[PDB]
Design a binder for these strands. Sequence first.
RNA 1: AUUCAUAAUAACUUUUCGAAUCGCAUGGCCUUGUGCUGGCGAUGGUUCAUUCAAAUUUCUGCCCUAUCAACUUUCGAUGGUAGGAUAGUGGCCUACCAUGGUUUCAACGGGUAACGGGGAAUAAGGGUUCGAUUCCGGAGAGGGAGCCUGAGAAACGGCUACC
RNA 2: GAAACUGCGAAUGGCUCAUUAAAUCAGUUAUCGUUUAUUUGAUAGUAUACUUGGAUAACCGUGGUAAUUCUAGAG
Lengths: 226, 260, 132
Amino acid sequence: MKLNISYPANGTQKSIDIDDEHKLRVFYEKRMGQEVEGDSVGDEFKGYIFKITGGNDKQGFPMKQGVMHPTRVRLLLSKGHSCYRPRRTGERKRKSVRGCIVAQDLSVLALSIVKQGDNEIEGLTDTTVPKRLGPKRANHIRKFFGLTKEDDVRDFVVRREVTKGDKTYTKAPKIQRLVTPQTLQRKRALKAKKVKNAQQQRDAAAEYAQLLAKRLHERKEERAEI
Amino acid sequence: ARGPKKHLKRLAAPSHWMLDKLSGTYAPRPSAGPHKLRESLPLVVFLRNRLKYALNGREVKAIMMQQHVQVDGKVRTDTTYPAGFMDVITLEATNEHFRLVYDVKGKFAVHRISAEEAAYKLGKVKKVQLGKKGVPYVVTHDGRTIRYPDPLIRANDTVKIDLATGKIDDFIKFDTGRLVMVTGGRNLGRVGVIVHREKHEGGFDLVHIKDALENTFVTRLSNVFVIGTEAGKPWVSLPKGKGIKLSISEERDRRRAQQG
Amino acid sequence: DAVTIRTRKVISNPLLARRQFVIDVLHPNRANVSKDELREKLAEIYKAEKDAVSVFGFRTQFGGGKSTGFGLIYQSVADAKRFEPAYRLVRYGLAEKVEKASRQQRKQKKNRDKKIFGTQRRAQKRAARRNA
RNA sequence: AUUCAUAAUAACUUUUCGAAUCGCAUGGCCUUGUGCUGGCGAUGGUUCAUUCAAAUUUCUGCCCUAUCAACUUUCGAUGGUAGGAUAGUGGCCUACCAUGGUUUCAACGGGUAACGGGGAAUAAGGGUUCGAUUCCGGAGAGGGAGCCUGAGAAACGGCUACC
RNA sequence: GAAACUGCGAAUGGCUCAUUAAAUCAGUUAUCGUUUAUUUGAUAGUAUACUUGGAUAACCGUGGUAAUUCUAGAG
């Protein structure tokens, strides 16, 4: 029963394997998201606490949160649910899924390390990985670099440089919600168009009012000659 | 049938487009727009089958993608734009102008006009009523809406509209003695002058008309398009014929006479 | 032998910046000339370049001899390339017939991309790892 | 032709929307500040109009059959009042009430080797026969039913279930 | 210029004639009895703002099932 542990702190994943069925009882009858003590699992695992994040059964079906069964059910899955991707808008498929309760019939158990123990795993704790891209929206740059509102954000976005022999350069994301004179001009244009339209409607209403009063005048003479 | 049709079979296309039978299965389907599907002429027909400016519809697409072709002055790129009665089509690249007008034989003849002429049109008043905020408007036969019209205007009246600002220049009251032009029916394309109107409550009103040559012909009120104020003075140019019907023997005589 | 070119129904076509007319060849004692030959004669007559001239649709009257056709006189290679389709240009040489596969092969490929979500590299490397 | 449009008053609302969007040119004004400003446009938005549609809907008109003369009304049949539901009218459905509705001028039932029509064949005239099928209208996607999405489908080159 | 998100289309078309006999359909009406993307006209100044937040895909990365246009954990 392979165990798919991952350590979010370092962005590290390692698939291990446990065979001795006497050494997996600590997970039996646990649910998804519940915490588990790593002390009883093997030896390299003293002090560890894991979060049960998921799993797949012997037939390959994934676990789903909220199905409190230790076996499989069939559900009408739609958009927004786990274990389903709609193929067209409004589609719903009835699919077989594995419950969120852990038994011996699982093939794999997915785990997240909540807190490191005392030893090190060769590739799950000692090493790290970086986040593949940096902030792209302006205010997330401010939040993450602790910048100020007034600081120039244009030149301090992180760049990644690809070295294809020669003529080498960095590639930087465009900043969305960055403020430019273009944005100000567009806002001014829209406000001015609202102003102009209101003006011209007021003028038209006034002119029609004078047309009404005019024909009132001529109608008064027309009726005053009878 | 589950939803709106997007194809028009060739045999189901209106006959006044003179579409040849054996070209292919389908016909242009005029887009939703200012005029009815049946009583309009889509631009691809106008710019291909009339003027021969294009050998096919792909070249019609190319021509209109280059801002060449205009309807009522505005630029249109919808190949199937429902151009209809009184519409003005401008072609600046060729230095040429047109106006869709019913030739007496019953169709849309290729009516060339001048640049000064290609800046206005005419519009029948469908109805008059108050919108929101009590503002009065009148609806025309081309889906144009105009606010603050003359307080005297009622239904069945023709208005002059400038093609640039969308404003009304001048209009006509509907009464006996007006030059008109039949919009539908068997009397299509012919130009007459109002003689009398008979009012049927709940039914369809009837109008009695007379050509320049003395011919009294009746028509549904809904097919009457006022085109002037008196006899002999239209507010637009008229095609080669001035809207008077000639019998088949008359036309044959004229063809022999012209050709020698 | 005494080939003549005769034109009627001439349309000046500025919208496509070209010119449309009908072309008749009066050739006796001959089957017919190639379209390209009419392009060189049209060029020499109207002092325009060869690549600005395009002709098509040639049919001969019953009894041999006279043939009709249709031609275009553009006003640059640039224009005759802007307003023209690929097949005429492949006829002349102003383009190349693109080396696409058969229609069945292309459609079958496109349907075969419908069975993969995401990038092809991802599926390729995934299947390679699972086939170890 | 209206309790129409439109308007007013008092209140109401798990507050609808009255633009935190995008491209190219970059101008003019100085009280020179990354200043105030402003050109063609993309896209979007409430309501009304129009256009493309839809859903109902009036009147008249279908082949053979009585070895089909009564039919409908329990469980809606015909009508009334009130509601519910619908996009909306309406027994469309519910509650109460009345006993009605169709028929020899052929109802109702049965047959159809019946989708309807524009049309086709033959044709002195009057007729007879045919129309699955190039256009228009309807209906269906093995049989049945039920839905999602969407302006629009009871959709099947969409889903769900049974056979 | 891939992928993916978003939007739009997929209710058109094409096929068939099984059902269906006041049903469909034809001509003729009605909507003062309703919904309507789109098109085209119009049309809203209403009593942190040098422009607010947090999610996920695409992507790298560990995988599971004999198998499907199956998908799960993690960044």
